[PDB]
Design a protein around this ligand. Structure first.
Ligand SMILES: CCOC(=O)c1ccccc1S(=O)(=O)NC(=O)Nc1nc(Cl)cc(OC)n1
Ligand SMILES: COc1cc(Cl)nc(NC(=O)NS(=O)(=O)c2ccccc2C(=O)O)n1
Ligand SMILES: COc1cc(Cl)nc(NC(=O)NS(=O)(=O)c2ccccc2C(=O)O)n1
Ligand SMILES: [Ca+2]
Lengths: 349, 349
C-alpha cells in the first residue's frame, strides 16, 4: 500500500507577473546590496507538482490546499500515512498538487524594504495575520476547545506537533491573481477535476466559471459560499448574536450558470452542531457556514445543476475533522471520492 | 528515462520551536481576529520530502537547496527534465529533499502585526531583502550581463521565466536555527550524505561537525568559506579594490577537525575567470570565493582530511552555470556524483 509506480513526475512554475524598480542595472557595481535599482521581480507565480501513473485512466486531478496550507497535506498525513496524492496515483489518475501564490513554494512578493513594499508601491501589506495552534484546533474541530477531542475523533492523536507545523500565514495577494494562476494551469493540463479544501473552495468555483476544462469539483468543507449577484439568501448571524460568517461571494449570473454544467460535491466532516452553540464560536460558525453552502448548492440545482452535499456521517463515517483526507479513515474518504469520479465517468478514458 | 518505482514516498515537518502571545484563549469569543491573545505559534520548522526505491543500495542522500530556493530545484529542471531526485532514486538511493526554515514549505515566522513581530519582540526583521532577475542572472553566471549568455552555456535557454520564478526572499532566521533543524533530521535518518548548494554549503559543513551521521558532503558552488577560529588566511579584495567576498565562517578547531573524518567534494562550474575582472562584479566575486574555498579544503587536508575541489571543465564538461544539477548536461553532472559516492563506498550496503 505504500508502493507507487510513476511513469513520470516533476514540478514547474506557472502564472504570475513582473514588477520593476527604478533605474538601470550595472554589472560592474556590487550586486549584493539593499537596492531595487534596475530590478525585475517575478511575483505571484504558483508552484505545481505532478505524478503520473503508468496507463492513466480518466481525468487528471488537481488537489488545492486550504487556507494557510501547502500541497504537503495531499502528500502524507501528520502520522506519516499516505495522502491522497499516493492514493489516487494508485487509483490510476495523474495527480497535480499546487502551492498557490503566497503559500509554500508559491511566490511571496517581497523586495528590498519593508515586507511587501517595492519603493512606493505596496504589493502586499506589511502587517500580516496568522492563526494560532489554539485557533486552528477549534477551526478544524479536533474538539470544542484546545487540548480536547470529540468522542469518536479520526484525528491522528499524538501527532499534533506535525499537524500544526504545516500551517502558516498568507500575504495579502489578490484572490483574482490566485484564481488567474489556476485558470492558467487548467488551460495547460486540459480537462481535469478540481479537488479543493476550505479557503480554496470558493476559488475553485470561480476557476470553473472561467475555465471549461474544469469537468467536476469536489470541495472538502469550503469556507466561503457563492451566489449570483444580488441573490444572496437571508443568512442568520451566529449564536453570539454579534458575529457573522464570511460574506458570501457574488458573481454575475451568466458566470454562476456555468456551475450548473458540471458535477459538484461538497463534503463535510463530523461534529458540526445542528443547533446554536454560543459557547463554541467555531462550531456555531461551521453550522451556519454549512447552511449557507446548502443554499448555494440549491441555487445551482435550480439552474439545472448537479450539485450535492455529502455529510460523511450519513455515509457511515464518524469523527472526521476539517481535514478528512488526512484523518485516520482517509482511505474510506478516498473511496467516496473514487465513487464520485466513477459515477460521472471522470475515471474513464 | 522518466519512470520511477517507489517503495514509499512522503513528507513531514521536523525541528522548530514555539513562541507564545499574551493572555488566554477563549473558545466562545470570535476566533478570526487581529490578536495574538492566548496564541501558541510553531516557528522555524523545516519541511522534508522523501522517496525510497525498492531495494535501496548505500546511504540516503539529503539534497539541500541554495539561497532563496526550495527542493523544486532537485525535482525538475526549468525546461522540465528530471532532476537529481528522480535520477538518484533510479540510482537506488533513498532521496530526501528539504525546504529549510524560512523557505518554501518551511516556516516563515510571522504573526498578527508587522511582518516578523510578535507584540514587542522581533522574531525576524520587518525589512526584507531579495535578489532581482538581473542580480540572479550574473550571480548564476548565465552570462556576463543580464540577457546575455556565454557561448558555451549549459543553461536551458527559453525557460528563463520558469527558472527565475523558483527564487525568493528569506526572512532573517538565525543560521543556528537552520543548522539545528537539519541536525535533527540527520539524527532521525541515520547515516547519510549531504548534497548542498551555494548558501547551504557552509550550513552543511556546520551540520557535519555536530552530526557524526553525516558520512560525506558534496557541495555545488558553496557561497561562504569556513576556517578554524583565528586561522583565516589572507584573502584579497575583489578587482574593484573595494568589495570583499563573504566573511569566512570561523569555528572551534575541535569541531573543524571533524571535517577531516569524511570525504568532502566541492564542485564548481565554468566561466569563473582566472584573472581579476573589474568590469563584471560577480564573475570576479566567484574567482575570489573559489580561491577561498581552495584554501579551506587545504586546511581540512592538513588535518588529515580527504577534501577535494572538482572543476567541471577538467572533467570534460563545459559551460555549466551555478546550478549544474539543472543544466542541460545534468545527467553527466549526476554521473560524477555517482562516481564520488561509489569511490567512497557510499553506494553499498
Ligand atoms: C508553449 C509551451 O507552454 C508554456 O510556455 C508554458 C505554459 C504554462 C506553464 C509552463 C509552460 S512551459 O512550457 O514553460 N513549461 C512547462 O510546460 N512545464 C511543465 N513542466 C513539467 Cl515538469 C510538466 C508540465 O506538464 C505536465 N509542464
Ligand atoms: C483559526 O483561527 C484563525 C485566526 C486568525 Cl487571526 N485567522 C484565521 N484564518 C483562517 O483560518 N483562515 S482560513 O482561510 O484558513 C479558514 C477560515 C475559516 C474556515 C476554514 C479556513 C481554512 O481554509 O481552513 N484563523
Ligand atoms: C544576486 O543578487 C543579489 C542581490 C541581493 Cl540584495 N541579495 C542576493 N543574495 C543572494 O543571492 N544570496 S545567496 O545566498 O542566494 C547567494 C549569494 C552569493 C552567491 C550564491 C548565493 C546562492 O545561495 O546562490 N543576491
Ligand atoms: Ca472557500
Amino acid at each position: 500500500k505504500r508502493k507507487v509506480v510513476l511513469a513520470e513526475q516533476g514540478s514547474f512554475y506557472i502564472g504570475g507577473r513582473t514588477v520593476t524598480g527604478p533605474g538601470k542595472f550595472d554589472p560592474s557595481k556590487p550586486v549584493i546590496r539593499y537596492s531595487n535599482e534596475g530590478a525585475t521581480f517575478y511575483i505571484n507565480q504558483m508552484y505545481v507538482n505532478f505524478q503520473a501513473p503508468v496507463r492513466p485512466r480518466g481525468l487528471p486531478l488537481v488537489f488545492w490546499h486550504g487556507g494557510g496550507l501547502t500541497g504537503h497535506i495531499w502528500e502524507s498525513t501528520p502520522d506519516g500515512r499516505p495522502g491522497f496524492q499516493t492514493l489516487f496515483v494508485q487509483d490510476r489518475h495523474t495527480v497535480y498538487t499546487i502551492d498557490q501564490p503566497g503559500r509554500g513554494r508559491g511566490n511571496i512578493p517581497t523586495f528590498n524594504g519593508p515586507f511587501g513594499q517595492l519603493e512606493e508601491e505596496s504589493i502586499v501589506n506589511t502587517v500580516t495575520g496568522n492563526s494560532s495552534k489554539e485557533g486552528a484546533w477549534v477551526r478544524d474541530r479536533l474538539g470544542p476547545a484546545p487540548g480536547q477531542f470529540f468522542e469518536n475523533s479520526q484525528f491522528p492523536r499524538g501527532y499534533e506537533d506535525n499537524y500544526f507545523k504545516e500551517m502558516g500565514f498568507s500575504p495579502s495577494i489578490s484572490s483574482d491573481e490566485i484564481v488567474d494562476a489556476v485558470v492558467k494551469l487548467v488551460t495547460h493540463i486540459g480537462p481535469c477535476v478540481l479537488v479543493t479544501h476550505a479557503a480554496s473552495g470558493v476559488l475553485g468555483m470561480r476557476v470553473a466559471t472561467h475555465a471549461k476544462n474544469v469537468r467536476g469539483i469536489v470541495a472538502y468543507e469550503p469556507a466561503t459560499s457563492i451566489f449570483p449577484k444580488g441573490k444572496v439568501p437571508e443568512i442568520p448571524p451566529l449564536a453570539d448574536k454579534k458575529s457573522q460568517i464570511f460574506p458570501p461571494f457574488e458573481i454575475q449570473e451568466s458566470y454562476f450558470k456555468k456551475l450548473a454544467k458540471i458535477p459538484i460535491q461538497f463534503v463535510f466532516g463530523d461534529n458540526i452542531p445542528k443547533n446554536p452553540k454560543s459557547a463554541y464560536w467555531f462550531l456555531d460558525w461551521w453550522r451556519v457556514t454549512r447552511y449557507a453552502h446548502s443554499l448555494s448548492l440549491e441555487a445551482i440545482n435550480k439552474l439545472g445543476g448537479q450539485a450535492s452535499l455529502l455529510d460523511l456521517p450519513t455515509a457511515g463515517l464518524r469523527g472526521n475533522t476539517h481535514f478528512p483526507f488526512t484523518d485516520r479513515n482517509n482511505v474510506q474518504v478516498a473511496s467516496l471520492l473514487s465513487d464520485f469520479l466513477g459515477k460521472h465517468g471522470l475515471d474513464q478514458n
